[PDB]
Structure 1
């Protein structure tokens, strides 16, 4: 089933020869997903079963792209205050974020991400909660105010 990349995939720290799989509690008031926990998958950067852990900031964003292996790009839209005119303007910033196999994420879904140790050159958050939500037009042109 799961593995076929050219090294054995193991879920390290599971243990096999004594006991009585493995997953962790994540905290910060979040809930470990049932689909993560009783899922069968193997990972290393998943926040529910890797060695990685969440610490730092917690932000909400909108998913734009789903098309890498287990990795997503989120846009944070926000309003910038311009002191000259006492007024605002839209500006935005992309955060590349690791996913998990647990969620099933579609372009325009809202996601709650957390900060964690660096997992790739620009992958520096990982997804904690998938807030499902249909969208019209294209997400790249869309504006959510969170």
Structure 2
């Protein structure tokens, strides 16, 4: 079932009647997956299929959640240097990202996300490329320096 909303999920930029489905390239060498080019699914905020251009930062993360609809959480784990102790310390930050159903992403999977406009109250990113990866504890606890 494609049309799940009260509205008709169309795909802006499609052009149905005249001409010789719509996707774009997004750039920075991130290959548009098969599932975007083939495989109907409408998404306003897909990098490839929709109308959001990714631009600004690109940062790899590691997914913590799939619980939201078409939306993912990724903790960036990183090292904050403290000059007093000339040592580091694990620190982190949970970036919420928009997904788009071209990417089937279970937790612990590495992703890379481009920036893009403010899509919601907190989701300013969308996932461009999903490496696979496997995890055994909780993704919560995996430090992957990156």
Fold shared per TM-score above 0.5: yes
Question: 1:4, CA displacement in angstroms?
Answer: 2.0
CA RMSD of aligned residues (A): 0.7
Q: Deviations over 1:40-68 (max 9, x none)?
A: 11110000111111010010000000011
> Could you tell me how far apart the structure 2 residues matched to 1:36 and 1:18 are?
22
Q: Deviations over 1:76-101 (max 9, x none)?
A: 00011110011111111111110011
> Could you tell me how far apart the structure 1 residues matched to 2:134 and 2:85 are?
35
How many residues end up aligned between the 2 structures?
146
> Could you tell me how far apart the structure 1 residues matched to 2:133 and 2:43 are?
26
Task: Give TM-score scaled by structure 1 length.
Answer: 0.98
Question: 1:122, CA displacement in angstroms?
Answer: 0.2
> Could you tell me how far apart the structure 1 residues matched to 2:145 and 2:91 are?
11
> Could you tell me how far apart the structure 1 residues matched to 2:18 and 2:136 are?
53
> Could you tell me how far apart the structure 1 residues matched to 2:88 and 2:56 are?
28
Higher strand share: 1
Q: Which runs of 5+ in 2 are unaligned?
A: none
> Could you tell me how far apart the structure 2 residues matched to 1:106 and 1:145 are?
20
Q: Which runs of 5+ in 1 are unaligned?
A: none
Q: Deviations over 1:108-141 (max 9, x none)?
A: 0000100000000000000000000111111111
Moved over 2 A (4+): none
> Could you tell me how far apart the structure 2 residues matched to 1:38 and 1:102 are?
9
